[model samples]
Structure formats: structure tokens, C-alpha cells
Target: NRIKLVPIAPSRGIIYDRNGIPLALNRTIYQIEMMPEKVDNVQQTLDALRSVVDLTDDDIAAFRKERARSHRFTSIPVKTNLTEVQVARFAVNQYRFPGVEVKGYKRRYYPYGSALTHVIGYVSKINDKDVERLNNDGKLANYAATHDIGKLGIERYYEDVLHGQTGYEEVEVNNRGRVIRQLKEVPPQAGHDIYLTLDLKLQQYIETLLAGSRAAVVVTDPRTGGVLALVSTPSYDPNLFVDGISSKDYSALLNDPNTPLVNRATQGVYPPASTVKPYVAVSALSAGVITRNTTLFDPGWWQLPGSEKRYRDWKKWGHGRLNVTRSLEESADTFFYQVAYDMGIDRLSEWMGKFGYGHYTGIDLAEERSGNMPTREWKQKRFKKPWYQGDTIPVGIGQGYWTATPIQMSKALMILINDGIVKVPHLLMSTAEDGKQVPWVQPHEPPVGDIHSGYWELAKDGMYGVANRPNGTAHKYFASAPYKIAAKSGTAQRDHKLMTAFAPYNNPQVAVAMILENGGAGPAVGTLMRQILDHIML
Candidate 1:
């Protein structure tokens, strides 16, 4: 008895927004295929195909490449993603080509296209490399009938969930090797659909505000830490990648000056600038380097008490007399400088690391990078040098060598807004299996260490003053706000603009962290936060 096997490919899982909007799904794509052995002359069949349907040199070449290694009776695709006109044209004259047939297959599609490209990513046909990679992962059998694999973002990160189990059919064959009858079969189980916390509505709105700028923004729910909108501007259409992007288009994305392929929200690293001052203040207070009522006199600039060099405050002319709370409101660099020097490098490193710097943000994406938080040991390992007091001075103001990702900054802000309780910043909200909605429970980390309640309130007071008080760094931007706001802005490296804020200050609802390349951290971003908070809060 001759036996044969036929594989059934399960439908891939669909990705939806928090509100049930389909982000990634499959649609039928019509293609023209040719069985070379059945054709009298391949050239004539191709000519016939060209006369009725659109054909390209690339298509013909790909067909030739496949025909070289194809089984005698196996069907090979010659042209895929056929237009409706082409489908109709070939249908009306089906008798003209004896060896060719038109068929439909599921192809991945993204509805919002460019808007969600960075987050939804795309799938592409599995290649020789993918074949070997799957074999190593012990997943080659499951992918026997699967043509595509997720390439990036959520598509890549949740590949296992989206890739369903494979099923097969056993059949008895005739002596001539033709299948005669099916002996047994197992139906394939489709993949489970997933929902992301992202709000497509808010994501698109923020994109409009970015206005083609090269930047990254992460918006989160302070209570749950669910990412509402994550935008990396200068986005490209991931749809171009589903069926395999053309060489020219792929190179366009690769060679673009803005580097659209980078997911800036989680991967972009920059000095947190003054945004981390509040966290630093908390550390200073907890370590007893600075008390809640601690005040320092800033004469615009000060050097390490008879040191050779002068370390200047951002205010240049200086913020005369400053307490722990007012220091944050004014972003008095001198205050953090003195506190940091007094606290020393070792303690600063530990505190900053505990604050989420140089730590994973617990995001679902795979591209997130934990930026560097330089410590005395880290410096010796990295730069092969000892940490200088001067280096620790800049660290005070969230500068020098410390770089943090926007996601990490957002996570830190949420922790502060939540009063030290750790909140995981996540995107996946829930999943649907066989029409039943199952909510996802995001994991958590330990709290941001034990500290007095007074210290946190003192830091919050500073951030509150920054948004509400007249002399505060960000007060003007929040002066007309309809509700209470707490924010901190930063300008780092002469051009990088950064801002982190939480809305409805009393009962924080939304937390935002953003960085604009070559843009301002103050009014430029503060004003934008007002607009964003208005949309989300109002």
C-alpha cells in the first residue's frame, strides 16, 4: 500500500487594538501558478499569461528559479498578488493556457499601514536561512505548510502565539503514485488572536503632532502601566514587507537619513536630562545626603570647593537659595551636583539602577535596549578608567555618560507617580481564543526600594511646582491647564529635548515620556503634553 502525506496550514492569529480594531489580519491574494511538466512550451504559456495578466521580469525569473528545483507535478507560483482585472482577464480565457491555473492564498495585511508599522511590523516568506533556523528551534515540522515568518516588532515577539499547530492528512495511493483515497486526517488548530493596549486612535493623533519630526514617544496608564500610544516618528509602511519588499524599497528604508526602521520609543537612548532629577532627589533624601528642608545657595556656578574647574548650573546666573522641592522646580543643577558629590559615585549608580535606568522596561517588543548607567565599576570595565569627581558632577543632573531609553524613563515616571510601587510597562492587553476573551496579566517587579513617604512627596512637590509655580521651569506651559499636572523637562547634549509627565496630578491617570531629536525639552514638549493630556484626560 502506497501512503502519502498532505499538510494543512493553520490561519495565523489576528492582532487587534485595545478597542477591537484589526491591526494585522490575513486576506486572500490571487496568484497565477504553472505546472511546468504539464505545459507543452513554457515560453508560449508565459506569453499567453503576459497577454492577459500583468507579468514582470522579476516574476518570470522567480518562476524559472523555482522550476529548476520543483517536483515534476508540483505547482509553482509565477505571479502573486494579482489585481482584480488580471484575475478576471485570466479567468475569461482559461482554456488558452493548459498548464497554468489561478489560485488564492492568505497574505498578511495591515489596515493602518504606516501608522502602525513600527509596532505591528510585518511577515515575510521563509527563506533558506529561516528553514535552518526553524529546524534548530524544533519547529520546522510545524511550519511545513507555512510560507511566512514574523520579521519584527509584535509580529516577531509573539511568533509562537501567532503560529498555530500543524495538521496533516494521510492518504492511500495507487501503484502509479497518484493519491487514491484519504485514510485519516487531523484538522489544524488556528492561532489565538491577541489584543494590544495601544490605542490606534491616540497613536495616530500623536503622530500628527510629531509632524514628521525624528523622535520617540511612549504614553502609558499610570495605574496599569499599559502602553496607550508608542510612536517613533518617520514611520514607513510595513505592508511593503509582507509579500517581501523590493530591493529598492528595502534599501530606501535602510539608507534613509532618519532611519525609520528603528523603534525609537524603546530603543532610542538619550540623556534623561533633568527629568531624572526628581528620582535623584528621592535618592539623595533616602540616603540622608539631603533632607526635605535641605537648601543650597547657588551663585550661578560653583567648583568643587577650591577645585581647578567650575561647574555651572543650567540657570547660569544661578537660582539663589533653593530647597529640595524648589531645586527640582528650578532644575537647579548645582543642587544635584552637590548632592551627587556628597552621595558619591557608587551610591548614585545603585540608586539610578534601582530607578529603572539601565534596566528592562518589561515591554513585549524585542528591540528594546537598556541604555547605559555608568558606575565606578562600569567605567573601569568600559572606559578602563577610574571615576572622577567631575564625572559624578554631571551625573547629578542626569548627564555625562548616563543614557536611558524612553520606555525606561516612562517606567521610572510611573513608579514615581505610583509612589514607588513597580508598574510593568506592557502592550499586550488580552487575547481571544475561540471567541473567548482572556485578559493578560502583566508581570511585576519589586518596589523601588524602601524610602520614607516624606521624601517621595518632597520630590513630587518639586515636580508639582515645576508645573504650577510661577518661577518653575515648566510652569508657563501648564499655567492654563484645566487640571492639576506634574512634569519635568530636560535639555541635554545641547539639542536633545526630553519631557516626562503624569496628568491629574492628585490621582495620576496617564504617564508620558518623550524625546525630540534636536528639539527643546521645555515649552516645545511641555505644550505638546498639554495637548496630549487634554485628549486623554479631558
Candidate 2:
């Protein structure tokens, strides 16, 4: 009889939140595999295997196809995700089903399904194409005898660190391909443990609040630059991929309009809307074109100088007169319009660029989009048109070509809160060594230029006023708070409309940036914000 040996993948590392909360974990599971070359008749072997253990038509068909693709002696998956009963039945009749074997292996699982899908990404089987790519990257050495790899999310970002070098084992077999008891072997080490800076409870809490919304939320420690939570709504349970997703569940996940496959916190780009106002205003101040005392009179709308196309104010009646502080507090578009045009894209881009715009923050997450930031050079290159003052107008208001991912905006805010230091955003809070702890630190943020004069205080007061002063739009919503949370609310123009009136006032501690695809202008987003805050608080 022909005899052959196969390499088995080693158990992977565990993924835990900062507080030692399990996210992606592994469990011992029994699986069934077959080698067709050892079986004289494939049909007869499968029939015998069926008598020993349950086999679905689909499973058998899949086995036939997989086996056909491999050499006869190569083991192929016949059925995975088998239960104890099936394993027992197969073991009892092992002698009858030629080339069939049942074995225990580690299977991935997510503790809190759906909620942490985007945060703790899953792993899957490595295909032939993956092998070719791995060989090309010179990673074949690391996997001399291992299988599977970090394909996406953090798994992909810190692949080298999270992945361990594969070791080898040689098992001697008898003439009939039966494994002999004793053999020389090299043991493989389990993959490294990843400790995220995430707070599982808080992540779950945010997801619970945003259950049905198509939104992304990021919470970071303004002081330390640690991301407390990163949440994207409309997520699916990751358990589906632990062993392998069911066809029906996979189809539903793909068909779902909310886009369960997307990682919104780090990937979803949106017009920052008025949430970008503070950055623009600060940019202007840094350029010396504007200052804290700088003021703009609002006609409730603005048109490019000598142009009649009205860029209407979010406050249609108009915010009569405003300064830097009041402008951001009330989210006055007219004020930002003046700043964007007067400060110019070059200067604006230069300053905001320092605060994480027009580039990736280089966070420890994969496939993050560097949301567009319209600069003079970018505009000239794309449209081949001379920069227009009106371009600055939309950009200033966080519309037009200015877009940012939720994590990007959060990092920008961190730059401001952390006093111009740009820290590397990472998830893991520790590393492992003999079960020893290697503590994590929020790496010192890279330093950028400082704010001019009272610019910092002016912007800070606006954020503070949003929660402190009664006249502040977010005041009523933030009247009472557990932690002294300072925040602002914003809605970007969507099809020339807004979300709701009460969206902003609803949520105080949670800083919200919402846009209703095409809802007409009003305080709709503010209303939604209120509901969000209530949900978080409750």
C-alpha cells in the first residue's frame, strides 16, 4: 500500500482585549478527512464512511471535488465541524472506512459575536494561491511545516509579530500507512498572543447602542492615545468563520445592505461635514490669516466672491454674527467659508495635514483608506483647473473633496487633545514571554506645529461650551454627565439635507458625526445624536 504523511497547522495565538478579555479564541474540535489514494474505490470508501458517520450530500460532493484536486495520498477534508457523536461513531468503525481519520484540532471562535467582527478579524484555510504568494515573499521558511496565516485586519497588520515560526514533526508509518507509535519530531510553538488596547465592555456597549445604524464609532483616550473602542454597526457574528461559514449565513452576510464585510471605523470614508470645522479654523489661525478675535457676519448663506451660487448656511436664518469660538460651537458654515477661502488650501492642507488629514495615521489595522483632503496641488493635478476660492468654501465646511475615516478624525482630535503629539494607534496592550507580561504604552505622538495665540483655548472652549453653557447647542443634551466629556456634534450636507433637529442634543459624552444620506436640512442629526447619547447612558 502507498504511504504518505501530511503537515498539520499548529494552533494559533489567542486575541484578548486590553483587560484580558477574550476576543478571538480557539477550541478543540474533531474533524474528518480522507485520502482517496489509499482507498481502492472512492465510492465504496465514502459509502463505508457514511455508514460509520453522518455525511451530507453536500459534504460528500465537496470531498469528491477536493480529493480530485489533490494527489491520491494527500488527505482532504471530507467533513469538518463534526460533533462528539460523529467522532465517536467514526472512531468505533475506523477499521471499516479505509483512509478515513478523525482528529482534534483548534478552531477559532469569537466570544461576543457580531459586535467585534471588525476588531478581531478571523482566520481561514490557506489555498494554493496563498502558498505561491507566501513562497514569493520568502515566508516559506517561516512556514517550513505550518499552514494558515494572518490574512486580514490586525492579523495582516502585525503578521510577523503575531505569527510564529513553524517547526516540524516526522511520523513513521507502517506499510499500510498506519502511523507507528514512536517517532522523532520537532514541536511547533503556539502563535504569539495579541493584547489589544480595546475595552471589550465598552466596545460591546457602543455596538449595542448602534445596533441598527449604518455608522462607525471610535473612542480614544485623548491623553494616552489608546483606542478604548472601535465599533461599526450592522456587523455579523464572526463565529460563522470559526470552522467555516454556512452557505446560507455567508450569502445573507453578503446580501445584507449594511455591508457586514466592511470595517467602517478604519475604512469607511465620509465627508467630515462640520466636524471638520475646528481643524480648518485652527489651520487658518496657524497660517496667521485668522485669529481668535477674527469674526464673520453670517447672512445664513455665502456665495463665492462675485459668484451667485449660494452655499447655504446649515442655519438657514443665519448665525447673525460669530467669532472663532461661537462658529465651531454653533457649527457656523459661513465662518468656515471665510476661513477656507482666506486661509487657502495650501495653508489649510499644511496645517490639517499635521493633524492626520490627507494621509493614513498608520494605525495597527489593515486596509484603512487615507480619506481625501483637497489641497491646491491635488486639485490642480486632478481637474487641471486653477484653484478656485469656492473650492476652499466647501472644504472648509467639511464637504466637497474633504473626506475622512472615523479613525482618522479620531486621531486628528487626539493630536489636538494630546497637544500636537501624534501617537501610533495600536490595539495590543501587552506581549507574552513565559506567561510574562510586556506592558503596552501609547507611543509618544510625533510632534507638529503649535496653535497660534488663543487659537487652542478658543477651539477648546467651543468644545467645552458644547457641554457647559446653556446656550450651547449640545448643552441640554449634555446637561448632566458622568465624566466631564467635552464634545461637539456635526452633520454634513447630504443631498442638500440634514438628519433631524434633535440628533446632536441627544448624546453628550459620545462625540457624534452623523449624516442622513438625503434628508432635508434641519436639526435631524442633532435629534439622532440625542437618541444615541440616551442609549449610551441608559
Candidate 3:
């Protein structure tokens, strides 16, 4: 009847880069806490803490709110991350305070800060919501003595893996539930260390390239589908959220127009624009609606069979008569308009769906949106309106309801480059337990969708032309590129610009997709792509 159990927290697993560089680890820090039931004078205790540390109004207010929720006997932390000077100052006057105690705890730390914030999310104090969730899962007892939990990104996605089994200490307690003496102890098992496929050098370089721009970039190994770099700009230091983010700091991020909290690489969706042409071309060719030699006249504008409603090409004065190859090389909207009209929305939707449009790419992250690849049924269900021929016209050129994420774009391109072989993109490379390495087993799904080798060749040839030929959309930027690249450029709503490519043309290594919000055309993105390729290829 006198025995009581106490929970013990174990160290969270370390997050490492592919090369074994630590991205996240635990650091020892001092925490100042108070046992409310033991404090005879709350005001006097506050004054004593104020004299030793710089406590703000918000800090004191949060402490009071925490006290309201926790039991009076529970040791509640008021201020953490105390410096040596502050700890020493408190120790000298320890006799003045009855319930206050300064102790050491393991706190999460991110060495790279903002550079890896989106991937290596920060941990904050567990709120009522977290407790409620744990209770619903019937696991609240596991975290009874734990102070924080993962809130986003990898931290939250692999919570069970990162949070080891809770251990306990058996102790003797008096009638008041105060610990009298410890009897037995069991050490908590540490979480398994996780390794990501990310290359640190490539990730840092991409972040530097994306600075001063609201953008996203995803680089994947075409052969293995391993994510080499995933970057989103306008990032903030995750350490700001590790303990308790101040209201002012949180509001700044919440109110900022750039939205530093949004992970643009997987969460943000943008119109595919001309970048989708290669996939559309494959569909059209496969349906026998168009052939490699199929030709269409581009007079800068197109008309429905019997209507005067004009759908204009990107060019002021079109490229005149063009075949499928030339059409893709020049990204002629007029050429695709005719193809879309012939295939109709039903066939178009089916084809795009096979290539992963209108669906999630099954990436390893959480909260990803499946971008729209509009069809007749989708329009009917979404807008409660009938699909029209006019709507199909815009879909031809990657406008209308066509949308995708940067990661999706890269995955789709890899499918084509790998000759219809689809590999699910993944982040984790291995897990470390007791000096033993357990490699991640990538899930295998058979190749989907069939395209004639001849048709794939035609589509790839056009992409190559886009980056190398004189009239190609991205030709100007990559004219002197050290290596060969097959690529396509896109311009979407709000002036968002994008580029997707796989290089070096002869032997594919990496497939990359980049998007710059509100960026005009797509040449700048092409240059950024070149620099990334140089780093990885070199």
C-alpha cells in the first residue's frame, strides 16, 4: 500500500543525415520548477525567481495557466534553458524558497536551425490537446512524466518510433503521496536513431539558392527514388518552438504574408502549366488521337468547331504549322488545344490519373494534398456544374483545374525517365539500434500504365529539344550547361514559374522539380536547377 510508481523519460532518438551527420539531438539544460503545494507564499516565490532570472509577463502568465491544469504536487517548470550564472544565483539563495528546485533535463536541439526546420520539426510543451490524444489512444500513462512531444514533420510522423517505451521507478510514499524512499528502478529504453536520405551539402546549397524567394525545390535520385534535397524558403528557426514560442514570435510567423510555416515542397499546390505537356503528349499518342507526325496549325489562337470563343497560344504570333515534336519543343498551346479537343476530358483524365495526376504520390510525409487533375465528373461533383468544351481547352495547356506539388512533378518525370517504372519516394534510409544498422525496406509496387517505347522516345526527344534547341522554352538558360538535360518550363497563376528536369541526358541520375511563386516565365528556375545539378553531378 505504500509503494508508488514514478515515470521515467528516455532520450529521444537522434536524427541524422545520410552521411551520419546529426541533424537533431538532445542537449542537457537546467529547468526551474516549483511544487505549488509546497510554496507557502506564491508572490514571494515569484519575486525570488525574478531576482535570479529575467522573467517576462508572458512567462509568469504561462506558469499560472500551467499550474491551473496540473496537480498541486506535480513539479511544474516555470523557466527552462537557464544559464550557469542564473543557476548559481538561484543556488546561493536556495534557502529562501521552499518548493523551487533547479534540475537538469534533456531538451531537443536542432543544430542547423531554419535550414532544416520543415523536415526536422521542433518539439514544444505538451498541451491539453496532446494529452487528450494520448488518452484516446490509451497511452496517456506512457507520457505521464514526459514534458514535450513531436508536433510536426518527421517529429510527428514517426512519433511511436522516436518515443521509446516508458520506464518506472518504484518508491515508498507517505499518506500525503510524497516520495519517502526509492525501492526499485527500471531504466527507460532509448528510441532508435533515424537516418534520412537527405544529403546535407545539397540541402544547404538549395536553401541558399532559394533565399529571398518564396519557392520550393525537390531533388530525387531517379534510380532509387531517394529524396536528396527538399527545400522551402522563408523558413524560420525551429529552435524558437523547442521550448515555448513567445506570442510575439508565433504571431509574426502566423501573420507574415510569406507564410514561413507552410512547407511548400509537399503542401503547396500550383498550376502545372506547360510542365504537364510531356505527360499529355504521351496520352494523346497512346490513344492514337495524335501521332509523332501529327501536325496542327498555330495562328496564335484557336476556335471551337462552331463558336467564336478564342483560346490563345502563349506566343503572340504562333509557330505556324507544327508536329508533336515541334509542338512540345516550343510548348505550343494551339497544338495541345486540338489534341485535348480530340481526346476529350474522359480520356484525358484517365491518362493523367495513370501518371499520378489527381492523386497523392504516396510520399513518406504527412498532410500532403493530392493536386487536382480535373475531369468531367470532378467538375460536376466539385462545382455542381456541367463540363463544357471551353473548359477542356484550358486543360490542354495545363491551365484550368490542373494543379500539382513540386514533389509530384518530380515523381511523374521519374516515371517517364525510368520507362514507366514507378518508385515510391522515401526519406528514411535506416534505423540504428545498439550499434546495429537496420535498413529501411522500400515498398515495391509494380509498374503502372503502359506506353509504347516509340512514344516515350518521342516525348523524351521533345523534352531534350526544349532545353537544347534554339526555339526551346528553356534553351536560352541551358545553352552552355556543362551537361545535357531534358526539361520543361511552366508559368502558372499569380505568375508562379516552374521547371522539371532529369539529367545528364545520356545517363539519368537525378530528377528535379522547382517552383518560384509569382516568378515570371521560367529561366531563373532553370539556372537554379543547373547549379544543383552541378553540385550533385560533380
User: What TM-score, computed on C-alpha atoms, does each candidate reach?
Assistant: 0.91, 0.85, 0.90
List runs of model 1 lying over 4 Å from the truth: 38-75, 83-102, 171-183, 435-437, 520-523
Write down the TM-score for model 1: 0.91
Q: Write the per-residue lDDT of candidate 3 for residues 1-538, one digit (tens) a residue.
A: 4998888897889889989999988988997888777667877788668877765677789889998899757888788778988888888987777667788888899989888878777877999999998899887987867889988877877777787878999988665455557899998988889899898888898888788789998899888888888888878999999878999999999999999899888888988899989988988988899988888778998888888898888899988999989988999999999988999988988888887877888777775778999988888999999999888888888888898888888888888887778877778888887658888775676664574467777888899999899989889776567789889988987688899988888888989988988872333787887777777877
Which segments of model 2 are wrong by more than 4 Å?
A: 1-8, 39-70, 77-79, 85-99, 144-147, 246-248, 306-310, 433-436, 439-445, 451-454, 494-538
Write model 2 residue lDDT over 196-279, tens digit each, in one string: 878888778767666566667676655555666777777887777756678998899889976868887788777777767666
Q: How would the candidate models be sorted by TM-score, starting from the highest?
A: 1, 3, 2
lDDT of 1 by residue, 1-538 (tens): 8888889888899998989898999998999887776667888788667778878778899999998878778888889889989999999988887667787878899989778877778888898888898899888989989999988889988888888888999988665454457999997988889999999999998888887788888999989989999999889998898888899999999999888999999889888889999999988888899888788789988788558888888886899998888889988988888998898988998988888899887888888899988888889998888988888888888899989999999999988887788888888898777768888776757787564477788788888899999988888888678888889999878498888888888888889998888873233777787788888887
Q: Poorest 10 consecutive residues of model 3 by lDDT?
A: 444-453
Candidate 3's C-alpha runs over 4 A off are 39-71, 84-102, 174-180, 433-436, 520-523
Query: What are the per-model C-alpha RMSD values against the true structure?
Result: 3.0, 4.3, 3.3
Model 3 has an lDDT value of 0.84
CA displacement after TM-score superposition, residue 197 of candidate 1 (Å)? 0.6
TM-score of predicted structure 3:
0.90
